[PDB]
Design an enzyme around this catalytic site. Structure first.
Site, short mmCIF file in Angstrom:
data_model
loop_
_atom_site.label_atom_id
_atom_site.label_comp_id
_atom_site.label_asym_id
_atom_site.label_seq_id
_atom_site.Cartn_x
_atom_site.Cartn_y
_atom_site.Cartn_z
N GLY D 67 0.81 -1.21 0.00
CA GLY D 67 0.00 0.00 0.00
C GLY D 67 0.84 1.26 0.00
CB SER D 96 6.47 -3.28 -1.84
OG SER D 96 5.11 -2.88 -1.88
CG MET D 97 4.24 -0.57 1.53
SD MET D 97 5.77 0.39 1.56
CE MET D 97 6.01 0.61 3.31
CG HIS D 121 7.18 -3.58 -5.90
ND1 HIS D 121 6.94 -2.22 -5.81
CD2 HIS D 121 6.09 -4.18 -5.38
CE1 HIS D 121 5.77 -2.02 -5.22
NE2 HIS D 121 5.23 -3.19 -4.96
CG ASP D 170 6.96 -6.43 -9.41
OD1 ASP D 170 7.53 -5.33 -9.25
OD2 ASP D 170 5.74 -6.54 -9.63
#
Lengths: 141, 192, 192, 192, 192, 192, 192, 192
Positions: D67, D96-97, D121, D170
């Site tokens: 997000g 990612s987060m 990513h 990614d």
């Protein structure tokens, strides 16, 4: 006497042996004639438990009073102080037998009619297959 | 909103929604389109009620226009599994899925209101994709159709051939006609 | 609307929702499309039940059409981690993920209703972008496919190559067929 | 619907929602797309537990697809500010987060389930407007990209150069691959 | 779903939501787009805490992308009015209005997290209609621009000319850069 | 969501909503677009406070962009009807309808925050249909215009001619300018 | 969010919503467009109050831009049917249906605020279909028009011919004009 | 919003909804379009009241424009089955289904308010598909028309031939017209 005032032993409210103390006053504190006396207990309805109580609170005004009266009504020797005294290790006590002492517990059991109304006309089921033949009737309390 | 009701009885007074109050009396409402979520809820009520008294009967009121097949089988299998006999009653209408659950009730405990309607039809479905996948899905729905006809024949008592012919297209049956067919056992006109 | 039920406990009576009452009996309901939010709710229930009584078995009811692969893995990994044996039951249907979680249950404690359906297929996915990134995402879905076929082969007991042939295209297995395949152990027809 | 569970305490029985019951045990659930609203909720939960017992370790289950960056940094800074060691666990996946927060956990207390899937990513962003404004916003995402890569190298232990190459596109990492990279410390296969 | 927490008090156990529990500790959360309704809620919390203890300091956690100016002025005016010093902490980010409220905190009690991102820009608005009406609204927004710049110069300590140049276009300042600019006083890296 | 607060009283601790708690202190919040539904809620609040203590004053906090005239006029007539004085404080902004209610407050009790913006304009409306109907509606809105200007002149103290000219087009007034115009009496810069 | 008010009496303290607290004082709020659902709610309040006391007067606060005619007649017939005199007070405005209910109040107990606007017009309706059906519906609406005019003339005291000419098109009225017309009896300006 | 009410009992005061409070007095409200969900709620109330007192009558207030026939028949069948006499009352209007339920009430206990408008029409429906399917559905709606007319003639007392002629097209009957027609027994002008 009044049942509301009575409380379980070991508490600041009152003790059930005070009932005999009141009777002793009329008989000139003579246990012999007191054994042949009659007793009346008012407001016994307030002693009833309300419902589904685990008793962890150790209800004193209610169930505790009933447990103490059990032996009293059927008949047991009771230590009654002379006058205006509370139970203590002191020897100021009077052995009084309640075996021949009649007891008349009178109270207004408010809400008991609803309990009776339920059992008489509780009914069984609510749907189409239920038996609702029983008809609630308007009757005096 | 649902209206709350109270029970003035001993051991305190309890307030419940009208639907929950009837559930205590072993009454389950099957209303609207059948789906996984509503069917799952009905399954819990059936399993729940079984624990209190497996001997007492459970009532199921059906006013559904039909729905998914998989969700319906979850209810059908639950009814046959539990020991208490499930009494089905048709209020308003009972379509393909509602009718299958209606006739699935315990023999002698299936009822229908005088002005209620019932309809039975074959399963409807569709698939978009490759020809190979179509054959897989087409075979599956045909198996479902054959399985449903077998069960309906068992409960109603009619032959498998008769059920197949009648279910090819929508067949509307009134409450008296349903009794003759075998979907229901009797009609509830007035309380006796 | 979800109905509320009463439980007669020692410390008076307590009101519980229909699903919470069954949770107290070590029953978890897996219904609808699998997703992160509902999956995290099932995981919380499994962990909570383990703390209460690790020895007692947990029951899982699966009526779902499948969903996200990652969300289902959270449930699968949680089941294997917890000491208690998770007994899976299939009501209505059990798609790709529902079937994977169904067969993931403890050996000898996997059940299925007689009219239930099962469906196993390979993963579904897609990506839009450059050729380089397409190659990346394509490798993972292929890797996920191999990983899911290895785990399914372990629980079912069939060879890996056999699972690949069947999973290539959608396959529909009835309750008795699933027993032979190895997805489930037995069928619950009636209470004994 | 969230289920309600009963907790037995010295004072008496108390009813808790499934998520609140686990919060009492220092368990925080991070689920779904990261955003400002859910992030502030997690922050409040962390600060609340720190006051109750700043010595006991907190747990943060992570099943999210990523997000907003800013919302995540609030959680990251909060985890580092407080005294309790935050033990991150990966359920299902960690984008990612989710991965940046996963690796941000206390050294030696980062875990991941065997079938979890981690992905890292570079930041994603965009702006429409004058060329001058485009240059302004472009420099920020570059700084954020460099700042996030620096922190990832600090936690994972990999060189900054390697993080840049791997994070350019990614990259999906399985649970064992993540251990070698440094995102996690151990895998929780079964309860010992 | 907002979790519930238990607080031990002399009277007995009490249940609070996570946000209300922190409000008891003089913590107000400013999250999301600023608007009339959320601003009035924050105003009510400031007044309530002032009455409870006008000597203790109030805290404001700002994580917002900005919003309406008029709604922000209601918060700013309330902060300066009440006797308690308002401590502003930036979590995640603080845009145009969030930054104005952040710097508006009590001198010496303004804090920022290390990875926070602060951005300040001039007001943006639009009007459609007659030329006469355009001249009216155009003059009004320019007045607000000058008023906002005059207040920022006071809190930050920078000259008015410098603020006009920097706020002409979006300017992003990190936590250390904000300390130099004067928006915040110190950074909260770790608990001491 | 709204944060709950605790109020200490002789009976014991009591729980109140943030808005309800302030309502106990004779504080009413007028927020957002004025409509019939919110206006009747404000009217009910006023009447309730009048019964509790008609001598004590009532504080109306206005932060709104205006709205329907009929709905706003139900609040004005209620304020003048009740015996207690209604103090009006402007937070953020007070548009055409919000300004009419602001100036309608008790003489000497009208206040405004230093950064609040008060805008006043003439009524706007529209109708579609036959020419005969347009004449009816056009005369009505013009009558309303004179009524509002007559009342605004009474409270502000300016002549009717000046109010008509100034309100012919949107006119923005700052907190100090409003004092000279007569819309408010004093500015609450800081608590004394 | 409607606020909660506490009523304190010797027996104890009770919490009610603002609307319910005023209901105890025989105050019913009519707000928004008239419809079956809102009208049914108003009807239930009238019957409930009639049961509590059939002698005390009932108050009805009207602020509504008219609505469905059939829904309005339920309220009107109910007011006349019940023994208690239903007082009507116009707040803000009273359109076609609101005005009919306003003037329908008990003689001598119909009030209006000084700035209220009262508008009366003939019924509005439409039908699409065959010519034969149009004649049926057209005759129905004309019968409703004559019936409404007769009732309005009875309450207002004006002649039927005068009411027909006035209600042919929208006729906006003011509080003083309504008094002479007969729609209301007095104007409430100040409590004295 | 539904306004809550308080009732006084010897055991103690109990809070009830406005509709639930009237339900205790054997009052049911049929409002809006008829459908399966609302109909099942009315059915549950009728059965609930039968259990409480099968001798006391029930009062059904009808205000609806009609709806589904199957849903309405569920209510109609339930009314006849239960021993209590359902006293129907028409508020505002009673369309095809509303009127059918109105006239279905117990003979001598059917009332209509003076300004109510009753309407009766034949069933309306439609089907899209093959000619064979159209024939089946057309036969079912015609049967429903014959069944409804047969029942209307029974309750109203008019001949079947007369009902068919009147129901071919929409027929609006005023309250006095309905009395002579037989739909209702008498008009409720006042309580006395």
């Amino acid at each position: 006497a009044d049942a509301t005032t009575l409380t379980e032993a070991g508490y600041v409210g009152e003790d059930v042996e005070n009932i005999i103390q009141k009777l002793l006053q009329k008989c000139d504190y003579d246990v012999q004639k007191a054994q042949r006396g009659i007793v009346y207990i008012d407001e016994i309805d307030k002693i009833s438990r309300k419902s589904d109580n685990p008793s962890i609170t150790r209800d004193v005004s209610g169930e505790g009073v009933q447990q103490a009266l059990l032996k009293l009504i059927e008949g047991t020797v009771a230590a009654v102080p002379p006058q205006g005294g509370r139970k203590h290790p002191q020897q100021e006590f009077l052995q009084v037998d309640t075996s021949k002492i009649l007891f008349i517990c009178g109270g207004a059991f408010a809400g008991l009619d609803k309990v009776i109304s339920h059992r008489v006309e509780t009914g069984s089921g609510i749907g189409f297959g239920a038996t609702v033949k029983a008809k609630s009737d308007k009757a005096s309390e | 909103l649902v209206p709350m009701v109270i029970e003035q009885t001993s051991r305190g007074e309890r307030s419940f929604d009208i639907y929950s109050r009837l559930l205590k009396e072993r009454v389950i409402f099957l209303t609207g389109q059948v789906e996984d979520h509503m069917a799952n809820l009905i399954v819990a009520q059936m399993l729940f009620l079984e624990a209190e008294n497996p001997e007492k009967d459970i009532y199921l009121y059906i006013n559904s226009p039909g729905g998914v097949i998989t969700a319906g089988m979850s209810i059908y299998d639950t009814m046959q599994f539990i020991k208490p006999d499930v009494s089905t009653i048709c209020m308003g209408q009972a379509a393909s899925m509602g009718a299958f659950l209606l006739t699935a009730g315990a023999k002698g405990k299936r009822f229908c209101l005088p002005n209620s309607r019932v309809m039975i039809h074959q399963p409807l479905g569709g698939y978009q994709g490759q020809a190979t996948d179509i054959e897989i899905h087409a075979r599956e729905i045909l198996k479902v159709k054959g399985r449903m006809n077998e069960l309906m024949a068992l409960h109603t008592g009619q032959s498998l051939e008769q059920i197949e012919r009648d279910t090819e297209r929508d067949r509307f049956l009134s409450a008296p006609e349903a009794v003759e067919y075998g979907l229901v056992d009797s009609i509830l006109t007035h309380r006796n």
